[PDB]
Each structure stands twice: as structure tokens, then as C-alpha cells.
Amino acid sequence: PIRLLVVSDNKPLSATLLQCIEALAGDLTVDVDLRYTAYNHTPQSMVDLGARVIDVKDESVVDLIIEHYDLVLSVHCKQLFPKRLVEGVRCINFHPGFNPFNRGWYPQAFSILNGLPAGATIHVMDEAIDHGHIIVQRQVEVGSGDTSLEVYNKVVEVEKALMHECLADILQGQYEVFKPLSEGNYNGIKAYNELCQLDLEETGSLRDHINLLRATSHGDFKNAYFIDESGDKYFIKVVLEKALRH
Amino acid sequence: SPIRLLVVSDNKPLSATLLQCIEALAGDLTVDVDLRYTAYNHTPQSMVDLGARVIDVKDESVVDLIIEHYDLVLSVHCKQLFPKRLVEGVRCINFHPGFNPFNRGWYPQAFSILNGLPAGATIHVMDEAIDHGHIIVQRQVEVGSGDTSLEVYNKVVEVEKALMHECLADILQGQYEVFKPLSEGNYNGIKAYNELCQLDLEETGSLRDHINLLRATSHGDFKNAYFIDESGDKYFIKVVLEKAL
Numbered sequence: 418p419i420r421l422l423v424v425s426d427n428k429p430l431s432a433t434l435l436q437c438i439e440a441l442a443g444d445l446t447v448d449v450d451l452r453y454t455a456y457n458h459t460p461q462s463m464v465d466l467g468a469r470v471i472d473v474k475d476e477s478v479v480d481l482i483i484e485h486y487d488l489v490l491s492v493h494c495k496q497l498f499p500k501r502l503v504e505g506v507r508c509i510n511f512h513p514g515f516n517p518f519n520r521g522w523y524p525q526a527f528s529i530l531n532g533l534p535a536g537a538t539i540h541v542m543d544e545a546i547d548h549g550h551i552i553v554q555r556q557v558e559v560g561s562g563d564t565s566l567e568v569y570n571k572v573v574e575v576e577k578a579l580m581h582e583c584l585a586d587i588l589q590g591q592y593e594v595f596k597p598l599s600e601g602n603y604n605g606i607k608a609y610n611e612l613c614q615l616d617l618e619e620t621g622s623l624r625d626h627i628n629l630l631r632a633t634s635h636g637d638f639k640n641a642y643f644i645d646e647s648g649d650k651y652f653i654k655v656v657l658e659k660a661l662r663h
Numbered sequence: 664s665p666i667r668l669l670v671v672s673d674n675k676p677l678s679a680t681l682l683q684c685i686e687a688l689a690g691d692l693t694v695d696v697d698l699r700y701t702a703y704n705h706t707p708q709s710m711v712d713l714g715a716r717v718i719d720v721k722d723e724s725v726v727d728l729i730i731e732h733y734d735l736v737l738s739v740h741c742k743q744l745f746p747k748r749l750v751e752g753v754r755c756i757n758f759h760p761g762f763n764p765f766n767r768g769w770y771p772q773a774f775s776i777l778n779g780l781p782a783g784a785t786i787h788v789m790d791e792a793i794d795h796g797h798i799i800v801q802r803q804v805e806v807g808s809g810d811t812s813l814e815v816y817n818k819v820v821e822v823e824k825a826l827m828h829e830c831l832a833d834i835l836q837g838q839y840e841v842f843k844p845l846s847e848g849n850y851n852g853i854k855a856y857n858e859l860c861q862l863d864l865e866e867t868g869s870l871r872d873h874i875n876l877l878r879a880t881s882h883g884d885f886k887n888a889y890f891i892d893e894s895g896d897k898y899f900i901k902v903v904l905e906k907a908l
């Protein structure tokens with residue numbers, strides 16, 4: 418009877434994970450707790466799935482997790498698991514990036530700027546961020562027309578496909594792991610906020626400037642901004658459309 | 664003897680506003696209106712809904728029947744250049760969505776976003792050259808730092824309607840001091856706008872310059888600016904801006 422804690426700030430991936438587990442209840446008994454984190458400013462969609470808050474950095478919560486669970490799954494979790502937690506119980510992260518490339522924040526946004534692989538990685542969690550040995554990953558192609566939104570949605574679909582394909586093996590420990598070929602590059606939220614903070618005076622190719630806007634364009638999120646002569650702040654995004662082929 | 668007015672227009676909203684301003688005068692000074700859309704208008708349903716029919720203002724038989732049968736011709740956002748024998752044959756007056764003589768010709772607010780020259784609306788007597796003649800009334804519109812072609816254009820269209828409510832009586836009745844523009848500023852053809860739309864991804868400049876090119880070529884659902892990637896796939900690109908709340 419596998420005791421599973423899922424720690425997630427993402428409703429659609431959590432819903433998919435709960436459905437995959439329910440579909441396995443014929444061959445494999447799993448007791449699931451679902452939790453979201455303190456950083457979730459807008460948690461009602463998780464609450465609707467039966468979740469409540471966990472502070473994974475709280476030392477008593479760490480004690481209790483190591484006691485009560487065989488396995489912790491991090492799915493788009495907004496909190497750093499502390500050292501004693503990842504060394505105390507098996508912790509596996511679903512990361513919307515292709516490790517070890519653009520580890521950290523909004524990987525597909527950096528992949529649009531720098532050409533590094535985009536995709537999804539399921540990996541063992543160590544003390545470092547998006548850093549432990551890889552269980553499985555799959556690349557997504559970044560199209561010329563894509564913004565952050567289109568690449569992110571393809572990454573989320575690939576994560577759902579990996580859950581469906583691999584969840585039985587992950588729950589049962591039936592897999593080998595591989596060390597990333599290098600440490601790779603890490604992007605913190607500071608590096609993203611500097612992307613968003615446009616310099617109207619900066620000089621570059623139209624390509625680099627369009628790529629910067631594409632990286633920061635994500636549906637209705639207010640990301641990239643300039644501030645004009647009168648100190649008015651304007652958010653800017655690009656919208657792209659493939660021309661009809663005739 | 665009612666004023667025999669020819670309105671040539673390919674724009675329904677401005678034509679709607681003009682007809683409305685005219686019946687507001689119905690009481691005091693009377694007008695016989697013929698409303699026409701140009702032979703260069705291939706989607707004229709919105710003008711037909713206003714009771715308009717086609718005029719080809721380059722058909723010599725048509726320009727004959729014009730000089731004989733009207734006192735005044737109003738051009739309001741019409742897709743044809745008026746011949747010489749027409750514009751001398753009558754008082755021909757144009758409603759221009761630019762602040763003459765800056766960015767005369769096509770889509771003025773687009774070129775104003777690029778080159779920072781004033782934008783707005785100009786009612787000008789029509790001479791031989793495009794958007795050149797002596798100016799009756801004009802109003803600048805503010806180019807907001809967050810505005811695209813669409814926002815500036817909509818501000819110009821409202822000023823054009825304002826100028827119609829304020830100035831039409833005096834325009835139909837000759838009641839104005841026309842003036843020469845302090846210079847002849849600059850003209851922009853359809854070529855120059857399509858050259859903006861054909862983005863060069865290798866071109867180098869300020870992010871300000873690049874954002875201003877996208878803003879200039881962004882206009883709601885019109886497919887304007889585009890690039891072609893390595894595989895030869897074409898993508899249209901626009902910018903969408905929002906003042907912070």
C-alpha cells in the first residue's frame with residue numbers, strides 16, 4: 418500500500434496525476450495526499466481537487482513527511498524541498514524543462530531566446546534545483562511562430578504523456594536513472610524579471626528583439642514592460658499567426 | 664435652389680456621421696446629397712447599406728456628368744485620386760486622417776508612430792497633388808506611447824466626426840479662411856507601407872525603433888507585418904500593449 422504525497426501548484430497536471438493513479442487501482446494500491454504550497458497566491462483550483470496547503474520547509478512537516486510517506490511527487494511545485502527532506506525520502510520532480518538546459522524558471526521562455534532544448538523531465542530531487550538524476554525526458558520543438566504560451570502548452574501535454582506512460586514504474590521504483598551530461602545553465606526569477614524589464618535604448622537585430630518579445634509573451638500574463646517619458650508603464654506582447662498556404 | 668452635393672466615400676462610419684450632420688441642418692440650410700463609393704471599392708456592402716452606388720471618378724463620361732450636376736464634392740476616405748479636369752471642374756474638398764502636410768498619403772498615423780511627426784485630421788481644399796491643397800481646419804491627436812495604428816486611427820476618426828459636427832455648415836457655405844501649410848512636409852505611398860510590413864530579421868537598431876515599427880504596422884485583425892523563417896514559412900506578427908493598472 419504505497420503512501421504517496423503529491424505536492425503541486427498546477428491543477429491540470431494534478432488532475433491528470435490523480436486520474437492515472439485511479440486507473441492503476443486495479444494492480445497497485447496507492448493512498449494519495451494532495452497538497453499545494455504557501456507560495457500559491459491563488460489556490461482555489463487546487464482546493465477544488467481536495468488539496469490543502471503544506472510548508473515543505475517547516476522542520477515538523479519534514480519529520481512528518483519522512484514518517485507518513487513512501488514517495489513524494491513534486492508537480493510544478495513553487496517551493497524548494499530542503500536537504501533533509503530529499504535525503505530522507507524518495508522525492509521525484511516533474512519539471513517543464515529538458516534538464517540540464519534552462520534549469521529553473523520558465524524554461525521554454527529561455528529556450529525561445531537561447532535555442533537550448535525545451536521539453537519535460539522527470540528526475541530525482543537532490544538539494545540543488547532541477548539537478549538530480551533523470552528518470553525520463555522528452556524534447557518539444559520550438560516553432561518560429563511560437564510564444565512562451567505555445568511551447569509551455571506542448572510541454573504540459575508531454576508531461577501528461579509521461580505520467581500515463583511511466584507512473585506505474587515511478588510508483589514501484591522500477592527504473593534506472595542517468596546523471597545529466599553537465600551541470601547546465603540555471604535561470605532564477607531575477608533573470609526572467611530582467612528579460613521583462615525592457616531597455617528601449619538597447620541595440621540588436623530585429624530577430625533578437627522579436628525573440629525577446631516571443632519569450633515574454635504568454636497569453637494574458639503581464640510580463641515585458643517599458644516606462645515612457647512621463648513614467649507610464651506599458652506591458653507589451655507579440656501575437657503571431659502562420660500565413661495561410663496557397 | 665438647394666446645394667447639389669456629391670459625397671464620394673469608401674468609409675461607412677464617416678459617411679453615416681456626415682449624413683447625420685446634414686439632416687441636423689435640414690431645418691436651416693437645405694442640401695441634395697448623392698452618396699457614392701469608388702470603383703476601387705471591392706467590398707462596398709457597408710456603403711450600399713447607406714444607399715450608395717458606384718462611381719468611377721476616372722470615367723470621362725462620369726466626370727462630364729459630375730461637373731454639370733453638382734456645386735460641391737466632398738471626398739471622405741475614398742480609394743480614388745480625382746482627375747485634374749474634375750478637381751478644377753468643381754470645388755472638391757477632402758477629409759484626410761492626417762495632420763497636413765506631415766505624413767500625407769497612405770495610413771498617416773502608421774508613419775507618425777515611426778517618424779514622430781504630428782498625427783490628426785485635416786479638411787483641405789483638393790488641389791492637383793495628393794493631400795496638398797489649402798487647409799480649412801485641422802486638429803492634432805496625441806500619439807500615446809502604448810498606441811498602435813488602431814488606437815491613433817480611431818482617435819483621428821472621432822476628430823473627423825467632431826470636425827463634421829463643428830464645421831459642416833461653414834464648409835457647405837464657403838465660410839472659411841483656407842491657409843497654405845508652413846511647408847509641404849512629406850508624402851507616403853502604398854509601396855512605403857508594404858516595405859515596412861516586409862520585416863528584415865537581420866536589420867540592426869534600437870528596441871525602441873523595433874517596437875515603433877511593430878506598433879506602426881499593428882492594426883487590430885489586419886495581417887500587416889510578417890517575416891519568413893529558414894524553411895520559407897510566413898508568419899504575421901503584431902504587438903498588443905496595455906497601460907499598467
Ligand SMILES: Cc1cn([C@H]2C[C@H](O)[C@@H](COP(=O)(O)OP(=O)(O)O[C@H]3O[C@H](C)[C@@H](N)[C@H](O)[C@H]3O)O2)c(=O)[nH]c1=O
Pocket residue numbers: 426427492493494495512513521522523524565569633634635638639640
Ligand atoms: C506567473 C506567470 C506565469 N507565466 C507563464 C510562464 C510559465 O512557464 C507558465 C506557467 O507558470 P505558472 O506559475 O502560471 O503555472 P505552473 O507551470 O504550474 O508554475 C508552477 O510550477 C513551476 C515549475 C514553478 N516555477 C512555478 O513557480 C509554479 O507556479 O505561465 C508568465 O508568463 N508570467 C507569469 O507571471
Ligand SMILES: Cc1cn([C@H]2C[C@H](O)[C@@H](COP(=O)(O)OP(=O)(O)O[C@H]3O[C@H](C)[C@@H](N)[C@H](O)[C@H]3O)O2)c(=O)[nH]c1=O
Pocket residue numbers: 673674739740741742768769770771812816880881882885886887
Ligand atoms: C486595408 C488595411 C488597413 N489598415 C489600417 C490602416 C488604415 O489607416 C486604416 C483604415 O484603412 P481602411 O482602408 O480600412 O479604411 P479607410 O479609413 O476607410 O481608408 C480609406 O480612405 C483612405 C484615404 C485610403 N487610403 C484607403 O485606401 C481607403 O480604404 O486601417 C491596415 O493596417 N492594413 C490594411 O491592410
